[PDB]
Amino acid sequence: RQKLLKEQEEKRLREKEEQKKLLEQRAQYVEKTKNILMFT
Amino acid sequence: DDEEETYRLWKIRKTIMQLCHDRGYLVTQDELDQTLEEFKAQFGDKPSEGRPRRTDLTVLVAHNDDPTDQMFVFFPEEPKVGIKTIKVYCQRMQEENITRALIVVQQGMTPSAKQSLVDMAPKYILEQFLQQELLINITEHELVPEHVVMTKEEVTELLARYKLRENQLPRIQAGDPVARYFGIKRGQVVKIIRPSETAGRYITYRLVQ
Amino acid sequence: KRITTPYMTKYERARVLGTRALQIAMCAPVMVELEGETDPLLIAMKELKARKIPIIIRRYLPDGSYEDWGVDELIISD
Amino acid sequence: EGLIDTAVKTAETGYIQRRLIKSMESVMVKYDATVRNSINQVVQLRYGEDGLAGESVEFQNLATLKPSNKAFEKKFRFDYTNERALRRTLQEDLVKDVLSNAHIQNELEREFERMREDREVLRVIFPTGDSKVVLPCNLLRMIWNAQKIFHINPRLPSDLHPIKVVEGVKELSKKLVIVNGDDPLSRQAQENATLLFNIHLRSTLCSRRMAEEFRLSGEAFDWLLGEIESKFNQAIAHPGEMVGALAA
Amino acid sequence: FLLGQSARDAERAKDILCRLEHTTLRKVTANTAIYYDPNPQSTVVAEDQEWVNVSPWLLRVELDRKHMTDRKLTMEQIAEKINAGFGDDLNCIFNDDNAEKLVLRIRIMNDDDVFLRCIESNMLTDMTLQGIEQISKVYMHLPQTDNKKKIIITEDGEFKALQEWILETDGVSLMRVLSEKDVDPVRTTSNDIVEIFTVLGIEAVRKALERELYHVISFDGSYVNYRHLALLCDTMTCRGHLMAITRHGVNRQDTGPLMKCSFEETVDVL
Numbered sequence: 001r002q003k004l005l006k007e008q009e010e011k012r013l014r015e016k017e018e019q020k021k022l023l024e025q026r027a028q029y030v031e032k033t034k035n036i037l038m039f040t
Numbered sequence: 041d042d043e044e045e046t047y048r049l050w051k052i053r054k055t056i057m058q059l060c061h062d063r064g065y066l067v068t069q070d071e072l073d074q075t076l077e078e079f080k081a082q083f084g085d086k087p088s089e090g091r092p093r094r095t096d097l098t099v100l101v102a103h104n105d106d107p108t109d110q111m112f113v114f115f116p117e118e119p120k121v122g123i124k125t126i127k128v129y130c131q132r133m134q135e136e137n138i139t140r141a142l143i144v145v146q147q148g149m150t151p152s153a154k155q156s157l158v159d160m161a162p163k164y165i166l167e168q169f170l171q172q173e174l175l176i177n178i179t180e181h182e183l184v185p186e187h188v189v190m191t192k193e194e195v196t197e198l199l200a201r202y203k204l205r206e207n208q209l210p211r212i213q214a215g216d217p218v219a220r221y222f223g224i225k226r227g228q229v230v231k232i233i234r235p236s237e238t239a240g241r242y243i244t245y246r247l248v249q
Numbered sequence: 250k251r252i253t254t255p256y257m258t259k260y261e262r263a264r265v266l267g268t269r270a271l272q273i274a275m276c277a278p279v280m281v282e283l284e285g286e287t288d289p290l291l292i293a294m295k296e297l298k299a300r301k302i303p304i305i306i307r308r309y310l311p312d313g314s315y316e317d318w319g320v321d322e323l324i325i326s327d
Numbered sequence: 328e329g330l331i332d333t334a335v336k337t338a339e340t341g342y343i344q345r346r347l348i349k350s351m352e353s354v355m356v357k358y359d360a361t362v363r364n365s366i367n368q369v370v371q372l373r374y375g376e377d378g379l380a381g382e383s384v385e386f387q388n389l390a391t392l393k394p395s396n397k398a399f400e401k402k403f404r405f406d407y408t409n410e411r412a413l414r415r416t417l418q419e420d421l422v423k424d425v426l427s428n429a430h431i432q433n434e435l436e437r438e439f440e441r442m443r444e445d446r447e448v449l450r451v452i453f454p455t456g457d458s459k460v461v462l463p464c465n466l467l468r469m470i471w472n473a474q475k476i477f478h479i480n481p482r483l484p485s486d487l488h489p490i491k492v493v494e495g496v497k498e499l500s501k502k503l504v505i506v507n508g509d510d511p512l513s514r515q516a517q518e519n520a521t522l523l524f525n526i527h528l529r530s531t532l533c534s535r536r537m538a539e540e541f542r543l544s545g546e547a548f549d550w551l552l553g554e555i556e557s558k559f560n561q562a563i564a565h566p567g568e569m570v571g572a573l574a575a
Numbered sequence: 576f577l578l579g580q581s582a583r584d585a586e587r588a589k590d591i592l593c594r595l596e597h598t599t600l601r602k603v604t605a606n607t608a609i610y611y612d613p614n615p616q617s618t619v620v621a622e623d624q625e626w627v628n629v630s631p632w633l634l635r636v637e638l639d640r641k642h643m644t645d646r647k648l649t650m651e652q653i654a655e656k657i658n659a660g661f662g663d664d665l666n667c668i669f670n671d672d673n674a675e676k677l678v679l680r681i682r683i684m685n686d687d688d689v690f691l692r693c694i695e696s697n698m699l700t701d702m703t704l705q706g707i708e709q710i711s712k713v714y715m716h717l718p719q720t721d722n723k724k725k726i727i728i729t730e731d732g733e734f735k736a737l738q739e740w741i742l743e744t745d746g747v748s749l750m751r752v753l754s755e756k757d758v759d760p761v762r763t764t765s766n767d768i769v770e771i772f773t774v775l776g777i778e779a780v781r782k783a784l785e786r787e788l789y790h791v792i793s794f795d796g797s798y799v800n801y802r803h804l805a806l807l808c809d810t811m812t813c814r815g816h817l818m819a820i821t822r823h824g825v826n827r828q829d830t831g832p833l834m835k836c837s838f839e840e841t842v843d844v845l
């Protein structure tokens with residue numbers, strides 16, 4: 001049972017890594033959307 | 041039409057996202073599988089002289105490990121794009137440190153323009169896709185196995201275990217649809233993982249050329 | 250570091266036996282006791298069972314290398 | 328019509344076979360155990376994707392494909408908890424070793440998880456649920472030869488420790504080498520080339536089938552394992568074999 | 576292979592069949608009678624319809640009904656394709672979808688006599704009202720065996736063949752078909768290994784070629800080992816393009832002249 005809980009929390013860690021990658025992509029999209037704007 | 045072009049625009053953009061995700065770039069899991077409604081709500085649902093007009097649904101994505109490695113995915117509105125049209129696309133890629141690009145023409149570009157794609161080649165790799173080929177993700181078809189582009193460190197280990205010159209592997213030519221999906225260039229090995237009915241799995245390698 | 254199969258393929262057995270029997274018929278000194286036969290293929294087959302054929306097999310590999318395997322080293326199949 | 332088609336058949340097919348042999352005559356199996364042609368370009372990395380010759384493979388059935396998620400469990404699982412049922416299958420001094428020992432019980436549970444994973448592999452290899460496969464050793468006739476050679480009597484409780492099965496199949500999966508080598512690139516491909524045979528081997532030589540169904544003794548199980556590998560090693564493609572002339 | 580809800584009901588699979596088969600005007604048209612009716616309100620005919628809509632020569636084209644419905648077409652789309660194909664050089668005046676006769680009227684506006692004939696032949700043979708080309712006709716089958724039945728692992732692990740409607744065409748496009756909606760872009764195969772090669776790839780041609788080769792061999796019940804079909808489909812697709820088994824496929828391979836002079840041509844290669 002304890003091993004099941006640790007595997008679940010590790011799946012939560014991978015969820016959080018997804019969260020930081022998503023914030024990262026959103027974070028560079030604000031810098032980049034400027035380039036799609038100035039491109040035209 | 042107006043509704044059918046929105047449907048096609050959304051399907052093309054989805055396939056582009058699944059491409060840039062397979063090429064290794066960084067796409068959010070939301071942009072990967074968004075549905076058509078929030079594509080309507082996101083741009084304009086009106087391509088017939090409206091808001092999801094092309095050159096506004098263009099995308100920049102940076103590579104996954106090298107965050108300076110970017111790629112544009114442009115969308116020309118000229119169905120038959122010209123030299124004077126990709127000249128400007130390349131003119132404002134030069135303002136950045138972006139080299140790779142991707143042109144999704146509506147009809148074929150002019151053979152006058154395709155030279156400017158190879159003449160600019162070693163300095164700015166860009167490639168075209170007809171918008172018709174992008175309406176489906178062909179790597180999902182059930183005949184197309186799984187293609188994995190090998191790194192140069194492991195090509196050497198492959199040629200070294202089998203003691204084999206790169207000239208003796210099977211070939212896949214550079215214009216293959218699945219080679220242009222992954223954007224491999226000449227002299228680059230592709231691993232292929234096939235489900236075999238006598239052995240269970242078979243891994244074969246193909247050198248691009 | 251010999252990497253080839255350790256079994257005598259069936260082509261090597263045909264060629265080793267034919268060659269050893271030619272050498273025996275040209276009066277080459279046999280490696281095994283003759284219980285009283287005189288055909289050179291029966292003798293060469295007896296010698297193969299006793300693993301006493303004095304021949305080594307040079308197995309070329311496709312890159313250009315090769316490996317020599319005595320006949321008494323690999324496992325005879327039939 | 329039959330007389331006309333015979334006379335055109337004779338001359339039209341004899342030309343297909345000639346075009347085929349000219350296109351494939353020099354493809355053969357190298358000592359590298361790889362299938363190349365005259366220019367030494369590699370055609371297949373192993374003969375037939377598994378490295379075996381066709382004169383020795385047979386038609387078998389995969390047992391773990393298509394039962395259902397409950398019939399699979401009550402047939403490949405080996406409960407060690409029912410004490411009464413194990414005195415029917417195992418002798419008295421083995422039913423305490425599997426009923427107390429938590430090492431043996433972890434081992435038996437881990438084996439079923441391995442069969443459960445092989446099952447999902449099989450269902451992506453053979454979709455459409457087609458159990459008939461072609462594979463080197465006929466295991467079920469080897470098991471049956473073992474019951475007739477050592478006089479099994481499947482009516483008595485057997486003395487074959489359920490763990491000797493688990494570990495003997497692990498040691499046998501090692502001796503069936505197709506791609507030789509310790510390299511990661513070579514361990515991967517040895518694991519691939521013998522993937523369907525290893526699944527079949529691990530699904531008919533279970534701990535549970537060997538005790539509820541085949542009832543093999545210990546001595547018959549050693550004979551059986553020596554027999555499986557000695558037949559597999561005979562199935563390997565001989566180097567030198569002109570396989571393109573056979574394919575044509 | 577139809578995708579979603581179209582795969583079950585024969586009704587919603589039938590309009591797919593309509594959206595793929597090639598329909599030109601000739602399939603729906605019945606009678607084409609050009610006329611020199613000078614005054615468009617004069618109408619040498621009995622038709623009170625022009626008089627509600629308002630060059631002296633027309634093309635009264637009377638359509639068919641049991642052919643216009645069995646493909647489910649309305650005159651608005653014919654009227655729209657009829658000016659979009661020829662631009663604004665013409666002025667179609669369609670009927671309504673209440674009358675018994677399905678008459679169109681064309682008129683030019685801006686060697687003039689033959690011109691309505693010249694455009695009524697380019698518009699009749701090919702106007703592609705509805706469908707994609709090269710598809711001549713599209714059957715519609717329900718599979719009987721388990722070969723094309725959909726197989727689906729259930730929620731208990733059994734396999735369970737489903738019976739869905741499938742189409743079965745006669746020409747080949749494969750790229751314009753996969754892109755159609757309600758069409759499975761996963762299992763829509765093609766029987767045509769040169770179509771697959773330019774669409775799917777070279778590693779898809781190898782799988783398709785072997786499925787074709789195995790269909791034509793096991794059709795009569797016999798069985799050939801698999802090794803021998805993998806090897807033939809591997810030599811055919813080993814250099815990255817489709818190498819035919821003829822003199823133009825295997826003699827272009829760089830095997831060395833003493834081997835090519837034995838197959839064919841024998842001196843041209845020497």
